[PDB]
Structures are given as C-alpha cells and as structure tokens.
Amino acid sequence: AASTYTENNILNALLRGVAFPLPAKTYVSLHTGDPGVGAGANEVSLSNWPAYVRREAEQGGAIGSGWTPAASGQTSNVNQLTYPANNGVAAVTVTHYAVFDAPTGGNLLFKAPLTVARTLQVGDVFVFDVGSLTAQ
Amino acid sequence: AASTYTENNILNALLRGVAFPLPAKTYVSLHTGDPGVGAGANEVSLSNWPAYVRREAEQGGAIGSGWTPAASGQTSNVNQLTYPANNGVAAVTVTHYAVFDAPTGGNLLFKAPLTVARTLQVGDVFVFDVGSLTAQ
Amino acid sequence: AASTYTENNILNALLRGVAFPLPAKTYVSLHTGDPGVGAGANEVSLSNWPAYVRREAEQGGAIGSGWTPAASGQTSNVNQLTYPANNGVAAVTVTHYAVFDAPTGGNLLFKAPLTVARTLQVGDVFVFDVGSLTAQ
C-alpha cells in the first residue's frame, strides 16, 4: 500500500538504474477519506479544519532524524507530532494518514489505515505518540 | 519477496533521506532452494552446473535498457535472457531466481520464486522469454 | 494572597479617597513557580510552551461578563477559558495562576495556588471550567 509515484521510483532505482529522488523533508498528512493511491489524496481535511498545518516529522532535524535506521525493515516516528487544535464549527473525523514531501502536493509517499479511525471534536489536539507510524 | 538489504535501502531513502545505492548493472541468477532473504542465497547452483555465468540483463545497453520504465508498477525484461548450456553430471532443479548487483555476492535486490518449478536436464539452455521476470 | 499593587490601590480607595483604576480587560495566566506577589511573576511559562496567549475572560462580553457580581464575596469564571494547545518541546508543569490586565505583564491583580497542581504533556489544551477561579 504505497503510491504509484514512490513505487515507480523504487522500481526505477532498483532496476532501471535511474537516480532515486530524495525527500528534503517529510510531512505527515491526514485524510478524512481513504487516499486514492495517486498523486494527491481523496481527500485532505479543509473547509472543516481552519488549522491544518503539515506537522513535519523531525521538526528540528534537517533530514534523517525523523525515522529510526532500518534494520530488516521497521521504523518509528521518533519526533512526536501535535496537530493544532480544532478551531471550531463542525466536528472532524480522521481515518487515514499519508506522507507528503511538500506542504501542498509534492507527491505522496505512504497511505496506511489507522487501527481505530479517530475523530476530532470542537477542540482536540490529536497528538501522535513516539513509536507509531511503523512501516515495512 | 524483497531482501532485507533492498528493503532497508528503499525505506531509508523514502523516509530518512539516505542516498539510494544504484546498481550500475543487473545480474539474474538461479538457486536450488530459496535465498535466505539476506546477502547471498541458499544456495547458488554450482559444482552441479560447471558453466554458470550469471547472464546479466540488458547485455548491450549500459543502463536503462533492460527493463521498461515503471508505470503504475510492473516491469518487463526488454532483452531476452538465455543461460549457457547445461554441461553435464547430474540434473539440476531451479525454482527461485535472484537479481544481483555483482556477479558474486554484492547485495541482493530481488528474490522471487518461479511460477513453474523447472529442472534442467543433461542438455538445457533455460531461456527466459521476454515478458517474464516481472517485478513490482 | 493579593498583589502589592492591587492591595495598595484597594486600601487607598478605602481610606485616602484616591480613585481606583478600572481593569479595561481581564487576563488569566499560568506560572510554574509562585509569582513573587510583586510586579511581574516568577515565572511565566515560555520557551517550553510556545503558545502562551493570555486567554481573556468574557471573550464575548465587552466588560462585566466574566464574573458574577459579588454576593458577600465569591467569583465565577462565567466564560470558560480554553488555552491554546501546547505546541512542542517537552512537558510543562502548571501550578499557580495569576490574573493580569495587559496581554503581557501590565500589573498583577491576583496570585493564588490551585487546588491541585496540573502537569501538561506535549499536547494539552488546559481548559478552565465554568465556576472555577473563585475569589473572596
């Protein structure tokens, strides 16, 4: 379960010999609806959540500090994430999370399901704990 | 079906930002049993097959010719792969093929099973038709 | 448990006959350690809690809506107070609150301990429930 862009890049780097793109920074993105798998998702939460900033992993670190070194797979979100609290109006529900390279657009790396789809009330922070966002 | 080393590469390149190692050329191989998942396989067929030159893909092209560019996944061996004739002694059975960066050792990109378990008799070429060896 | 400024002014209004400046707006704040009781506090929680807006009582009411009129004392935070979420860094501990006139400093009316000390992790809103902040 990864986007075609990243999977195509993986195939190209492994076999074609073409250079593999490097994400300058990694942002975690929340989508109320399950992302398509394509460039972008369906869909980001906007017009419901006025505060929807991309809380980047490794806030302090330039690169390479967001995720633990690979050891036969597996990592963890070393820097915990705190999204801004809901500003108001309607309650928001979150179902899937995805990774972005750029604040808007800039391709999509991962698309994964949360064990329990968490919803945000009129006010809630929705913090990510260290040890989540494990991948293979 | 992906080795630890290749999966470590892809995962770290996607998330951490470590540079992705690039295979200058790709070599295809056979093993009587499945490769471990680690570096090397269990085991490379030799002393049963006197001539076991790992027939590299894209024999003529330097790079980027062996496989089609990735499009929504999937790849195809553009150049046909024909192995040297089976010399003698006993019959050899092959079930798993592996893509190698080096002729001997040197990382292990792919480790995949063959759809049909084939044995090589006294005189055999074991040619790979164009359209097999698909990876994703 | 009233600051020197407020106590001097109240005593002056009660005996001398000098006019008592009316608080144009009322602000509620937090401090890790007890404020001195003098000018300023020791200390305001900053550089560990990036978002530290002084949430104004009676956000909608222009003036006089934050607290019920005194009936042989007693006060109540009629308009519930919800602080901005903790943005980052690490845990911040809040134990003593203070009422303020200006967005930052600008004289100090009250200083009183909480009934129980509260400890805030990386993500917390730290709301004030309606009916708290009682003052004699």
Closest CA to A91 of A127, A56, A115, A126: A126
Experimental method: cryo-EM
Closest CA to C126 of C90, C86, C87, C83: C83
CB B13 to CB A8 under 8 A? no
Quote the CA–CA distance of C97 and C34 in Å, as a whole number: 8
CB B70 to CB A9 under 8 A? yes
* Distance separating the N- and C-terminal Cα atoms of chain A: 10
B61 touches chain A (CB under 8 A): no
Quote the CA–CA distance of A74 and A69 in Å, as a whole number: 8
Quote the CA–CA distance of C94 and C45 in Å, as a whole number: 8
Helix (H, G, I), strand (E, B), or coil: what is residue C2?
strand
Closest CA to A83 of C120, C49, C50, C87: C87
CB B75 to CB A6 under 8 A? no
- Residues C58, C59, C64: CA angle, nearest 5 degrees: 30
Q: Which segments of C67-116 does DSSP mark as H helices, in order? A: none
- Please tell me what resolution, in angstroms, this structure has: 4.1
- Let me know: does A100 contact A24? Beta carbons within 8 Å: no
CB A82 to CB C125 under 8 A? no
- Which of A82, A85, A124 faces C122 most closely, judged by CB atoms? A82
- A residues 9-48 lying closer than 8 A (beta carbon) to B: 9-20, 22-24, 26
From the number of C-beta atoms within 10 Å of its C-beta (0-12, 13-18, 19+), residue A71 rates as: exposed
> Positive or negative CA dihedral for A128, A131, A136, B5?
positive
Q: Which residue matches tokens 């919803």?
A: A119
CA atoms within 13 A on the CB side of C50: 8
Quote the CA–CA distance of B87 and B49 in Å, as a whole number: 6
Please state whether beta strands B81-82 and B127-128 pair in parallel, antiparallel, or not at all (unpaired): antiparallel
